[PDB]
């Protein structure tokens, strides 16, 4: 698993056109402001571990920062070891699922299967992006 | 050489701390229309190989794009095999070099060595977001 941690003033992203022939996730939109953008690449080797580390370890960022408000926004252009995309959205699933035994805020998982638009702010203070990667 | 190609309809960044002892690059702000940003990491074995297929493919991706202006950022999160400071800003320059020769729109190198937020709004179209590699 490939991360990016951008911690933003705010953020907003909406579904376009279909990127998979039947997408998991239904289209949408949604806004926020202040949060941990978390960009998530899934990689060919995560599997349980990976999502546990994960979680943890945005767990803990988002302790560090103060934020409330995670967004785990799937996005395949983090890496080139990519997972299938049934195994993502099943990682990217169990992922949320684990962030929620470790943080006590809002999570919001963004749709996958889709091309979108987004708009961020980013903050421009020395943790404001980070890169991440765990395995198992 | 890792790269990230947003198709924008606007962007902007600001300097904000050094992120370097001595930033080789004065501070600054900027702010764009339709672009396409180019986020950048350099990596150890980029040389001039490496730029000028690097120039070529952005040219290229542009004109496909139709657009007519493009984003040097420099980015240290897209790949874990970085190059040193000093390596990266000497072949950012010349990637803006490069550039120049086979695009003919607006070419803005964003500031090196600094902390910086920024703001975009990507497009949502299926080849507004996509990665490249380049290698010698
Ligand atoms: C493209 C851009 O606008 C958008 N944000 C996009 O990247 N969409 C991705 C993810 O939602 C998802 N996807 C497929 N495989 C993966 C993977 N291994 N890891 C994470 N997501 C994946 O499926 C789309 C690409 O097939
Ligand atoms: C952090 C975030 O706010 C900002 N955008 C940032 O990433 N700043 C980077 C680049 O400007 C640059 N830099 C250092 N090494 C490299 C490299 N190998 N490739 C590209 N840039 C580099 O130096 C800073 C990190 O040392
Ligand atoms: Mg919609
Ligand atoms: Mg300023």
Chains 1, 2 share one sequence.
Not at 66 to 84: D, E, G, M, N, Q
Not at 86 to 110: C, S, W, Y
């Amino acid at each position: 698993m490939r991360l990016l941690y951008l911690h933003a003033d705010r953020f907003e992203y909406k579904t376009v056109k279909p990127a998979l022939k039947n997408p998991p996730d239904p289209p949408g939109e949604a806004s926020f402001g202040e949060a941990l953008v978390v960009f998530t690449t899934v990689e060919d080797g995560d599997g349980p571990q990976t999502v546990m580390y994960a979680a943890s370890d945005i767990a803990s960022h988002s302790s560090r920062l103060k934020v409330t408000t995670v967004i785990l926004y799937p996005y395949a252009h983090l890496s080139s070891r990519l997972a299938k995309p049934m195994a993502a959205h099943k990682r990217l699933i169990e992922l949320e699922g684990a962030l929620r035994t470790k943080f006590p805020g809002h999570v919001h998982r963004a749709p996958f299967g889709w091309y979108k638009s987004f708009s961020i702010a980013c903050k421009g203070h020395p943790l404001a992006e980070l890169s991440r990667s765990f395995t198992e």
